[PDB]
Design a protein around this ligand. Structure first.
Ligand SMILES: CN(C)C(=O)Cn1cccn1
Ligand SMILES: CN(C)C(=O)Cn1cccn1
Lengths: 269, 268
């Protein structure tokens, strides 16, 4: 991987692995999401930022401030086959005092065609108290020199899916997967649950017949609260719809405290 | 990756990924085991064998025969750091009518030193019926041309850990992790639970304090039965001692054994 010519974006190529593919012999959405986080991490490293998945400056580290994912939106047209090379280009953009946005474009290395796209919203938070705060000007300047100043949107469209409000699923859920717990492989270098695990947990309540006859086209996931290593999660899904649409809810098995909410769109193979 | 000059072994280089590392910023034993299976799969592909994790010939496919892991043994001296390049060399060897053995050597691409080694025992079985068979002679000829004929052992030593008999853990277990279930990410392209998930499940019953103050040096795992997609597993560990542990994976219900193993840990 490497920063592009203008130094305002980063590219990397990946060869799809045998254990990374599903029943269709193509990469899973979790393999895609892992690769987006890998290229994001390599972009933060190439310009001197922290690499613990929080992209902090030395100023943020002194104040115990971290960047956290508030929302992830992924759209896949073609899942890469096992052995195929996929090229991912990523860039970051300031969104004023709200926070930052990281975008991705996935391409087939052989054909050069866009096979997927992704966007994510990040907010600034105190690591310890979990309190959010708007971006200060002194912090803003530190990351602005690594971002394109004119807008560069992976999802340009006037009324696009990446910015839609997601409602809260009402009981009773149509489908559910109960008692999900993270194991050590689900944790990162800081012992926090990897954001990709929550995508997996959301998809666990999708019936196997949907997975067997459809392909996941869009996934929009909102992150409300972090699941701790010793927490237990319930995954809930209700059909909202040729295409199939679902409404999702991840909450703690006990008190029913919401950790995530999202939507998925599937297309018949 | 590519077959070596004599065509009897395969090499591949891997750059350690951010999500592949643990709290020490080095690769987990599950990341290592995934890379061993990846290079094994690429060696099977380069010589025309089956794509799935079964390395079958067209003759085995007609008789619904597959190669299955009976035992996995891994020894790590240094876990590669995030961003480091690790080179893995793998080869297969016939063991007469018992089955085959796949070996691995892990090296630091910068220093060239051996940072780890692995060995695995494979047996032939019917995929539907699950019955073992002692290699049909015609099958032997098909894979022998891809194996070194003289012995090439990753664990040469005469009384080494890779061939030790593992006993069955007796109740009550000292530690346990109950209600473990595989999710879709734990399955392979054929909807079977990946062998690396069982390594993860074994390690789940190791106390966090051991993981925090020690490094895993050796892991020997025996595979007795497959855990299905809708099965629920209990993970059991007892200290037998460096720290040594005895492990048992069994189904939560009837207590049917799926795996047994041992681990050896070194104080950091
Ligand atoms: C989400 N954030 C804060 C970033 O991605 C920061 N960044 C800009 C360029 C490289 N990293
Ligand atoms: C374990 N088996 C059956 C193999 O690894 C067969 N093989 C030899 C060379 C490439 N694949």
């Amino acid at each position: 991987g490497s920063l592009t010519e203008d130094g305002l974006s980063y590219k990397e190529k990946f060869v799809v692995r045998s254990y990374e593919v599903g029943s269709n012999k193509t990469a899973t959405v979790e393999t895609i999401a892992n690769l987006l986080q890998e290229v994001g991490c390599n972009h933060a490293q190439s310009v001197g930022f922290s690499t613990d998945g929080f992209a902090t400056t030395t100023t943020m580290r002194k104040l115990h401030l971290i960047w956290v994912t508030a929302r992830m939106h992924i759209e896949i047209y073609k899942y890469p086959a096992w052995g195929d090379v996929v090229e991912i280009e990523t860039w970051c953009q300031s969104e004023g005092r709200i926070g930052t946005r990281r975008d991705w474009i996935l391409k087939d290395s052989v054909t050069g065609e866009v096979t997927g796209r992704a966007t994510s919203k990040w907010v600034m938070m105190n690591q310890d108290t979990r309190r959010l705060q708007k971006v200060s000007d002194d912090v803003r300047d530190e990351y602005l020199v690594f971002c394109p100043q004119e807008p560069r949107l992976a999802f340009p469209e006037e009324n696009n899916r990446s910015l839609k409000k997601i409602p809260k699923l009402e009981d009773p859920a149509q489908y559910s997967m109960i008692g999900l717990k993270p194991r050590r492989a689900d944790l990162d270098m800081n012992q926090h649950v990897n954001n990709v695990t929550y995508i997996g947990w959301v998809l666990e309540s999708i019936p196997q017949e949907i997975v067997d006859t459809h392909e996941l086209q869009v996934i929009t996931l909102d992150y409300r609260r972090e699941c701790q290593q010793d927490d237990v999660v319930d995954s809930l899904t209700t059909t909202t719809s040729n295409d199939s649409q679902f409404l999702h809810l991840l909450r703690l098995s006990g008190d029913g405290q919401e950790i995530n909410r999202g939507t998925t769109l599937w297309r018949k193979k």
